[PDB]
A paper describes a structure:
Tristromaviruses, which build enveloped filamentous virions and infect hyperthermophilic neutrophiles of the order Thermoproteales, represent one such enigmatic virus families. A cryo-electron microscopic reconstruction of the tristromavirus Pyrobaculum filamentous virus 2 at 3.4 Å resolution shows that the virion is constructed from two paralogous major capsid proteins (MCP) which transform the linear dsDNA genome of the virus into A-form by tightly wrapping around it. Unexpectedly, the two MCP are homologous to the capsid proteins of other filamentous archaeal viruses, uncovering a deep evolutionary relationship within the archaeal virosphere. Our results uncover an evolutionary relationship among three families of hyperthermophilic archaeal viruses, Tristromaviridae, Rudiviridae and Lipothrixviridae, including the homology of the MCPs and the similar compaction of the genomes as A-form DNA by these MCPs.
To study the virion organization of tristromaviruses, we have determined the structure of the Pyrobaculum filamentous virus 2 (PFV2) at 3.4 Å resolution. Cryo-electron micrographs show the membrane-enveloped virions of PFV2 to be ∼340 Å in diameter and ∼5,000 Å in length. The helical symmetry was determined to be a rise of 2.86 Å and a rotation of 22.95° per asymmetric unit, where the asymmetric unit contained a protein heterodimer and 12 bp (base pairs) of A-form DNA. The native twist of the DNA is therefore 11.3 bp/turn (564 bp in forty-seven local turns plus three supercoil turns). There was no ambiguity in fitting the sequences of MCP1 and MCP2 into the density map given the resolution achieved. While a 3D superposition of MCP1 and MCP2 shows significant differences in the overall folds, a flexible secondary structure alignment reveals a one-to-one mapping of local secondary structure elements indicative of obvious homology. In contrast, this spacing is ∼30 Å in PFV2 suggesting that the lipids are arranged in a similar manner as in the host membrane, perhaps stabilized by VP3.
Residue numbers in the entry:
A (entry chain C), C (entry chain A), E (entry chain B): 10 to 128
B (entry chain c), D (entry chain a), F (entry chain b): 2 to 127
Write the structure that this text describes.
């Protein structure tokens, strides 16, 4: 009868709950799921550095600088460099040295862990 | 891999999608409430990517993605125009390396799709 | 009653879901299905080089250049050479050397893999 | 191989195709919604191949294929006229090898089938 | 009541679907069926040469020339030779040598395989 | 062989062909849609073979077969008149071998059955 994008989205879901393709979609890979382990590892490593940065300079801990330091880490891997330049103007002054600490100064530890995750 | 391919094949997707199509035509299935919230929210992202039609040449995915990323920040409950302009200048720089496009002609297509003034993307280029 | 192409397409589908020919169309071949493995192998072997090419030259990673370089690999295998020359004018300047790297410079590894896939 | 042959014969396709035909004539089966979406998108591809009727001679499959490949780029939501001309010039060069076809007569048929000007395909030939 | 050629075709089908003569028409032969195995062989042998002929002479691979080379093989077997000469004028110039390569130069391999099929 | 003969005897073809005739006479069977598609396409090949009636003599199967092969190429959605003349000149050369038949009397019948001019088949004879 009808075929538009609201009903294509619906009938694509009704076939999923019919054949149980979601739970067999997760349990059949079992090799992509180790990325959830590695992503939770770099997540803690950035967070611990942000508190150690905050008590050395006596500045308050700014929540959400974990995510800013992570987006700049992933775009550094791809090469979107002028995107890095505008975010570095957007963050406050005392935290700009922390963001380049995640990209350049821990090139050895953190940038390797993304290289194992995308592999 | 093939073993990840086989376990979705044996679940019978070609048969079961045919039966859901017949049930819709026999009025036994109404439109799900998730699809109503989807099409209400997505539609501003669909008409804007079609406004990048006059960009010509190479793989244009990086122009398309960084424009779709730029609309996501403006459409927040608390919109961030500074982080939206960060993704827009990556779209403009990715656009001008295509053969045939100028720096100024990419500033029309990006700012015309986003619906902002052209000088807002020019300020952040530097 | 009716015989037109919209009904020829329908009664082909109604015949398949009656006799269950789709799932036995896949599970009876079992030799053609190894082409998916060799396809996913060259898929990664092109993608990993595109990021290494992106960081050696400091240019951002351009998504879809792994798709373009896979098409030009197959047309080179067939012999559609004037198809290639118009595509090479379409891509940007810094990525033209990558596309001839996928065709010529890895004639050993990648061009043999397409030769084994079609066998 | 005949093993893939025997596994499709034993499924009984001759009887099932006859029986599904009778259900259509007894008005028990309506036109599937996939078929309605199929002929809406395909009918533009069917008439362009029949416009290649005045190309004469040899196996003409490569001329027919690369015209269908050229229309597919024009018919996207973001049509790429650069990559469409890439497949078109392969169809002209494949056409002129047939006995009886000149380069201008191949530029007649392909540009008449695609529905574009003849100078656009002449440019990329060089 | 009525007897024309349309309903003669129908009433021949209705006694096939009643007695199930199609499926027992195939499964009772079981000796003629290995002609499919030999037909699948010569199709592969012609196609592999047509790509190798396309790369030695630098020309694009012309699809359907594996079909023309197989028709001209079987008419050479029967002897319809003035059928051959008009088809040789029809094909392009650089592909004429491949057509007489299938009939003449591989008579030892390919023409024996047709000779073993009709037997 | 008899083993293939006996297996089709035991399915009862004589009785069931008699039974299906009775159902037609008792109005329980309509014309199958495969039959209506058949007679619409085949009818051009039926009257053309009857136009080869004035060829006299020997086994005339090669004249009949290559004329039906010649009409098949003309009746395609993209008609190939080059390959159609290739089979026709074989039917002409097969025709002239029969006693009582000349070369010009054979160009009468074959070009009359295909419905084309006689000079077309004369060109590819040589």
């Amino acid at each position: 009868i009808a075929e538009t994008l609201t009903e294509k989205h619906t009938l694509g879901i009704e076939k999923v709950v019919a054949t149980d393709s979601w739970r067999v979609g997760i349990t059949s890979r079992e090799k992509k799921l180790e990325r959830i382990n590695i992503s939770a590892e770099i997540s803690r490593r950035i967070q611990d550095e942000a508190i150690a940065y905050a008590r050395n300079k006596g500045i308050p801990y700014l929540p959400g600088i974990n995510g800013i330091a992570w987006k700049l880490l992933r775009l550094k891997w791809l090469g979107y460099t002028d995107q890095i330049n505008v975010v570095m103007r957007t963050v406050p002054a005392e935290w700009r040295d922390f963001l380049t600490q995640i990209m350049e100064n821990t090139q050895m530890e953190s940038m390797y862990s993304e290289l194992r995750k995308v592999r | 891999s093939v073993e990840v391919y086989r376990q979705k094949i044996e679940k019978g997707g070609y048969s079961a999608a045919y039966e859901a199509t017949r049930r819709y035509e026999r009025e036994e299935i109404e439109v799900l409430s998730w699809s109503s919230r989807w099409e209400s929210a997505w539609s501003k992202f669909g008409e804007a990517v079609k406004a990048l039609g006059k960009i010509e040449g190479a793989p244009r995915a990086l122009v398309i993605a960084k424009v779709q990323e730029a609309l996501a920040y403006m459409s927040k409950p608390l919109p961030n125009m500074k982080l939206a302009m960060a993704a827009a200048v990556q779209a403009v720089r990715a656009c001008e390396q295509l053969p045939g496009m100028n720096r100024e002609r990419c500033l029309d297509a990006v700012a015309g799709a986003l619906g902002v003034a052209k000088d807002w993307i020019r300020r952040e280029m530097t």
